[PDB]
Amino acid sequence: EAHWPQHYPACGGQRQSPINLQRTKVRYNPSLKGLNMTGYETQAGEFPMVNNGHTVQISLPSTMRMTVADGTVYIAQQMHFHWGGISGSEHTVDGIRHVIEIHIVHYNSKYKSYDIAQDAPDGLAVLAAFVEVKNYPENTYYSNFISHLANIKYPGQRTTLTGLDVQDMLPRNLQHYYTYHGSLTTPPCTENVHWFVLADFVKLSRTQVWKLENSLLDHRNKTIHNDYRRTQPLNHRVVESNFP
Ligand SMILES: [Mg+2]
């Protein structure tokens, strides 16, 4: 990880992710309003779910879109999860690492495809949310998804869901968030990712968390439990919030 900038120059940049969010250093920006999400509600349709060797990824339709403060529209591409089995999340908050972090990856609609956007300035945006566990009951919006993990145990296996509710897989409060400009968390570490980190958490049961952490195998046939990149310096960035 120390070596990344040798061959991937963006990794030696000033706007790298993930970061630790220190809440005392966050700036309230009243001109930030909502994420303006449309098309994420419960719907029928085909939602491919794959074990890619590193995570489970769910492909999303291009009718899922969010509009940021300046009017840029970002198109949903895929959703995936970061876990440990606390060693799960990439981002930390006030030094606290969470059990799982959920990422919805979007691309800027000014580009013709995800693949073009990935190498473009302002090409990407990620909606991120943490999971919290306590003594919560089963989160019913995860029940089908969790049940299908058993079908993609080996890398490259795929399964479909014919209905999903992405909005209600996210935290109950979708109004409040932190935002900053950052990068991919692995090489090539491209610095074109607008991050939105939700303030509210997703509640999962302990069993749900255990199943996510213990269901999938990697290419070496071992249970998936991968090393996060350390948090990176803010440098000249200031994390902003759309609430006091
Ligand atoms: Mg991710």
Swiss-Prot record:
Activity regulation behaviour: Inhibited by coumarins, sulfonamide derivatives such as acetazolamide (AZA), saccharin and Foscarnet (phosphonoformate trisodium salt).
Sequence ranges assigned to domain Alpha-carbonic anhydrase in this UniProt record: 1-243
GO annotation terms (biological process): detection of chemical stimulus involved in sensory perception of bitter taste
GO cellular component assignments: cytosol; extracellular exosome; extracellular region; extracellular space
Subcellular location: Secreted
Keyword Zinc part of the UniProt annotation: yes
Residues given in the record as substrate binding sites: 185-186
Assigned protein family: Belongs to the alpha-carbonic anhydrase family.
Name of the protein this chain belongs to: Carbonic anhydrase 6
Species name: Homo sapiens (Human)
